[PDB]
Amino acid sequence: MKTIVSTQKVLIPEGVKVAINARKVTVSGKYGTLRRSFRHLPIDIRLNKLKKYIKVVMWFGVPDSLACIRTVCTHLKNMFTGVTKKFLYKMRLVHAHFPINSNIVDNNTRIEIRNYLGEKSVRFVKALPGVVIEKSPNVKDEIYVSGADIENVSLTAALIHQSVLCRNKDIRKFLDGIYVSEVTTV
Amino acid sequence: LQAVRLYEKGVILGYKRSQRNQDPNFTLISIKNVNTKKHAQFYVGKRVAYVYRTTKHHDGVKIKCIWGKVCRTHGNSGVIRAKFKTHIPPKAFGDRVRILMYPSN
Amino acid sequence: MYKKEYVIDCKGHLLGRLASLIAKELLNGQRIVAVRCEDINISGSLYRNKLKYQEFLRLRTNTNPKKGPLHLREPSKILWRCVRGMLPHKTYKGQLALKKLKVCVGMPYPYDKKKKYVLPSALRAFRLKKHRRYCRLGTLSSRVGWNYDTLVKKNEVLRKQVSKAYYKKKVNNLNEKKEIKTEALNLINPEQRQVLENFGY
Amino acid sequence: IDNSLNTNIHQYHIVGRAIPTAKDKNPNVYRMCIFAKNDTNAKSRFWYFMKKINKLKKSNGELLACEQIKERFPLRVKNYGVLLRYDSRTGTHNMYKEFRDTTKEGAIAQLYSEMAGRHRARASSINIIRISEISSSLVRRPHIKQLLKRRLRFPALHLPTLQKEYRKKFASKRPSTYRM
Amino acid sequence: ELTEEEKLYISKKNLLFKRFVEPGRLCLIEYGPYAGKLCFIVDIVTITRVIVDGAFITGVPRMVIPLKRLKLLKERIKINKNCKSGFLRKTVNSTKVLEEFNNSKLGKKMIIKKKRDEATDFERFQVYFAKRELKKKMTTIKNKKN
RNA sequence: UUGGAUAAGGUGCCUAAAUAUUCGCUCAUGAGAUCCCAUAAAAGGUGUUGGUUCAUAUGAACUAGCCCUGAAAAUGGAUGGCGCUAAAGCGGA
RNA sequence: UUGUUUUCACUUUCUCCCCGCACUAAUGUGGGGAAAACUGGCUUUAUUUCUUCAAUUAUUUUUUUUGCUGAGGA
Ligand SMILES: [Mg+2]
Ligand SMILES: [Mg+2]
Ligand SMILES: [Mg+2]
Ligand SMILES: [Mg+2]
Numbered sequence A: 001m002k003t004i005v006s007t008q009k010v011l012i013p014e015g016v017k018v019a020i021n022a023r024k025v026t027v028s029g030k031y032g033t034l035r036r037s038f039r040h041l042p043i044d045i046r047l048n049k050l051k052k053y054i055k056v057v058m059w060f061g062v063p064d065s066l067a068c069i070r071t072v073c074t075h076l077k078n079m080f081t082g083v084t085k086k087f088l089y090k091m092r093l094v095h096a097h098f099p100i101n102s103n104i105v106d107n108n109t110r111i112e113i114r115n116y117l118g119e120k121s122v123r124f125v126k127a128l129p130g131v132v133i134e135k136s137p138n139v140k141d142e143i144y145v146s147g148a149d150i151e152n153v154s155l156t157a158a159l160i161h162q163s164v165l166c167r168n169k170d171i172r173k174f175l176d177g178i179y180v181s182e183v184t185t186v
Numbered sequence B: 001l002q003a004v005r006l007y008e009k010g011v012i013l014g015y016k017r018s019q020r021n022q023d024p025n026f027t028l029i030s031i032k033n034v035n036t037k038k039h040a041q042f043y044v045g046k047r048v049a050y051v052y053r054t055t056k057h058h059d060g061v062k063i064k065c066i067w068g069k070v071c072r073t074h075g076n077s078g079v080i081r082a083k084f085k086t087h088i089p090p091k092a093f094g095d096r097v098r099i100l101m102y103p104s105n
Numbered sequence C: 001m002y003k004k005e006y007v008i009d010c011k012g013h014l015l016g017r018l019a020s021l022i023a024k025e026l027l028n029g030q031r032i033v034a035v036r037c038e039d040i041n042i043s044g045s046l047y048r049n050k051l052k053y054q055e056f057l058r059l060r061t062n063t064n065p066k067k068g069p070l071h072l073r074e075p076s077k078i079l080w081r082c083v084r085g086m087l088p089h090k091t092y093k094g095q096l097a098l099k100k101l102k103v104c105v106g107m108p109y110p111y112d113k114k115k116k117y118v119l120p121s122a123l124r125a126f127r128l129k130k131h132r133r134y135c136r137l138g139t140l141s142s143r144v145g146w147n148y149d150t151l152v153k154k155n156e157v158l159r160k161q162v163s164k165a166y167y168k169k170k171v172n173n174l175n176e177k178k179e180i181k182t183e184a185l186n187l188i189n190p191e192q193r194q195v196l197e198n199f200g201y
Numbered sequence D: 001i002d003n004s005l006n007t008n009i010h011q012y013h014i015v016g017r018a019i020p021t022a023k024d025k026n027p028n029v030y031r032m033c034i035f036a037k038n039d040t041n042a043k044s045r046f047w048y049f050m051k052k053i054n055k056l057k058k059s060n061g062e063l064l065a066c067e068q069i070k071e072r073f074p075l076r077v078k079n080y081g082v083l084l085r086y087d088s089r090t091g092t093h094n095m096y097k098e099f100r101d102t103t104k105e106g107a108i109a110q111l112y113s114e115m116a117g118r119h120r121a122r123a124s125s126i127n128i129i130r131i132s133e134i135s136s137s138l139v140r141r142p143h144i145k146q147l148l149k150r151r152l153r154f155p156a157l158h159l160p161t162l163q164k165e166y167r168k169k170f171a172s173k174r175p176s177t178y179r180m
Numbered sequence E: 001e002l003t004e005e006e007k008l009y010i011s012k013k014n015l016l017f018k019r020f021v022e023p024g025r026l027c028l029i030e031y032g033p034y035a036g037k038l039c040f041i042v043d044i045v046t047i048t049r050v051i052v053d054g055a056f057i058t059g060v061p062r063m064v065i066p067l068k069r070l071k072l073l074k075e076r077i078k079i080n081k082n083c084k085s086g087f088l089r090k091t092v093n094s095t096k097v098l099e100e101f102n103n104s105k106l107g108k109k110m111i112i113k114k115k116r117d118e119a120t121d122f123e124r125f126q127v128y129f130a131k132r133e134l135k136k137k138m139t140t141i142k143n144k145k146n
Numbered sequence F: 001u002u003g004g005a006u007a008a009g010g011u012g013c014c015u016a017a018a019u020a021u022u023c024g025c026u027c028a029u030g031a032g033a034u035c036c037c038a039u040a041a042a043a044g045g046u047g048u049u050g051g052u053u054c055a056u057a058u059g060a061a062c063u064a065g066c067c068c069u070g071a072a073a074a075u076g077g078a079u080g081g082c083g084c085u086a087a088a089g090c091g092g093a
Numbered sequence G: 001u002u003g004u005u006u007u008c009a010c011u012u013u014c015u016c017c018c019c020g021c022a023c024u025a026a027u028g029u030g031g032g033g034a035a036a037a038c039u040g041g042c043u044u045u046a047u048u049u050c051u052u053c054a055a056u057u058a059u060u061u062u063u064u065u066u067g068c069u070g071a072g073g074a
């Protein structure tokens, strides 16, 4: 089957500058600028500057294709959120016998990990472009990873968690590691 | 500037054939601006000349011709079948021929 | 096919459909020069084509690999071998036809200043639905050991700058000629002006 | 006028009965409506169904009429609903379908193509029951409801279809698919 | 009502897709026996089939046509619900749309090509003679300029 | 022997003739490509396309088309080859 | 089991009004309600080079451009 038309509407917040030309999008705001392209799926999107509300419309489509409209709408909404309220990911590092020693260098990138299960070695990760790492001001074993782009910050947080996976023991008993505990904004 | 043309250009393709058989009585010709069956029927009675060169002189000159005729079309794309007074040698299959306009109507 | 030589740039064509349209031109008798062979497209995912090339690489003469299939990984030789497999290249006439093709990566001197054509019945834009997958021959050849992908782009940049300057000069000349034309129409016998007006010249 | 757009399907009206005997001398009279390529095929199907449904074989029957019903408004658009019965590889089934066209056999032609494409059903395994016209408020399928809105519009998004003569194989500028 | 602001704003959004299919589009025909003529959409049957009618001005009758054989044009005539041939003829005559298509960039070139195809031998020589005359004035003005 | 018009099969190149027209289906990190004929099953799939019933426009059951898993051998290889996905694949006209 | 006989639905318009007051993919739109017969349909003329007079079959008469062949010698 094919459907003639299908549309969805996404409003623009107050403090945001937008531009779309050939399925290429830029957004600007208080905390920087974001670029993203969509030239792999058939859409003609319409931007109303005087009002809000970018609109996405698709002519003759099928169920497999029609499922990509809400995806684009949510990606747009997330990048709108990014430039006015940075994304925050909170992480707790948990130990049983050996405490974990963290260390942030190089202008709040490049976290360093020591004493994981007491192993005398050093592990590194390096944050993606646009992401800043720091330790909490309130509680003992919290790290903050944050800033302006959900994809980059969430993938940095994922790179940290898989830094300290436990090798050939039983992981229902050896629970040491660094885990994401809450997701919010700044 | 000089030496007017007064003919249409053509290339001699192979013989009339199938896969694996030859039939050298007819030859297939392609005409320069003709690429439909209806337009090829326009030339269905004209005279064809194949002019080539030799190395020795034969009657004081070093050029000779083999004369032919346009008989019919070859189906959907403006190719023709031509019949010559003698069979064309197969060492000629990319050469030039002159599709004349003598028998005018 | 009534010309001394045709020049084709292959940027944006599918490999098989282009190779089929070249072979008949060669058989009928026509020189062909093919340029920018690193921008040819194929109609599968890049991984799916890398697997096919890996299958091509592991077949060889057991007793002596100096003989046997020879694996050529430049983009221009790939098209050369794909055309060779559509000609009767083991007779004499079919070997004559194979020698009337020349292939290049990039666009060297004699042909950077010649006119380039395209074959619409082999263009990806007209032949492949937009939700299918496709790859580029340069990336694939790099993945199997070609090692010259970067230098070609580096040279193409300079070529394009030179061409841009030439185009600017050409546009200026055309405008200057249009003015001289429009002035001279007023200074002709009136009936020649009507006969040019009627036929749109 | 354009023989590249025609289908070879027409409709027929056939009337028959059995030869009168000493036991029966006012036999029943039967009629049907069949879609076929020519009238000979229609008579073939008529005797096929007489034999299968009643006890009438051709060799002791007689035909009374073959008429070939034509269409009254060949340029107005109608909605049609069809009832089917076809044999699959592992059973026999029956379905209801809906089409949009300007003639009944113009819809039967569509039905044969759809049943080949979607189910691999040959014409020899398909029996057609009860073609009829239906009103626009009693339509059941979603792909017919699409076309009967108040103000129907859409852009044209097909690639060009040119004549063979202007289909020049070796071009001098790469064309565009946009065409606005 | 809408102020001028909104007003021109409606007239400033150049949409990607113009030239919709609807009663009144122009549709030069590109393939088939009636190739090279103009017509009008009067009704649409399915996604792919369209009923077409060029009034008795053009040499096409009312008939069904696959949609992929058409080329939509810029011009549209606002015609009614279920018009027929007689009223369509009056509407196309009164709106004066055919001869304002002829002034566009494509109608002029179509007409000029048809003019060139009907030329005789003497007319071809006249065109050659006029061009040869024009070349001399070209080349004398040029030599004066430099 | 000279012409003409076919059968069985074919019309992207090899290879003479349609990159013909007009409808549907299919994406395969081991696709598929037709008598003889040159192998594949039970059992499964929340892949996608149609259809049949029972329940206030959402649930459930069922059914059958293409695709996928089941699917392991010895020199390097075979829809005949190239290759082909707006088919040059499968079912029709 | 057929021929009548009744009931209610079937037309959209670039027209008007109310509600959302710009909400639409649309140089418009979603819901509710009216008007008209421009459009569509049907009658009576008197008409067919403004225009149409189709398609298939039966039965008859021509026509443009061209390929190949010339047995015999009463
Ligand atoms: Mg052989
Ligand atoms: Mg040989
Ligand atoms: Mg013979
Ligand atoms: Mg076949």
Ligand SMILES: [Mg+2]
Pocket (backbone or CB within 6 Å): none
């Ligand atoms: Mg061929």
Ligand SMILES: [Mg+2]
Pocket (backbone or CB within 6 Å): none
């Ligand atoms: Mg479920």
Ligand SMILES: [Mg+2]
Pocket (backbone or CB within 6 Å): none
């Ligand atoms: Mg084949």
Ligand SMILES: [Mg+2]
Pocket (backbone or CB within 6 Å): G036, G037
């Ligand atoms: Mg009134």
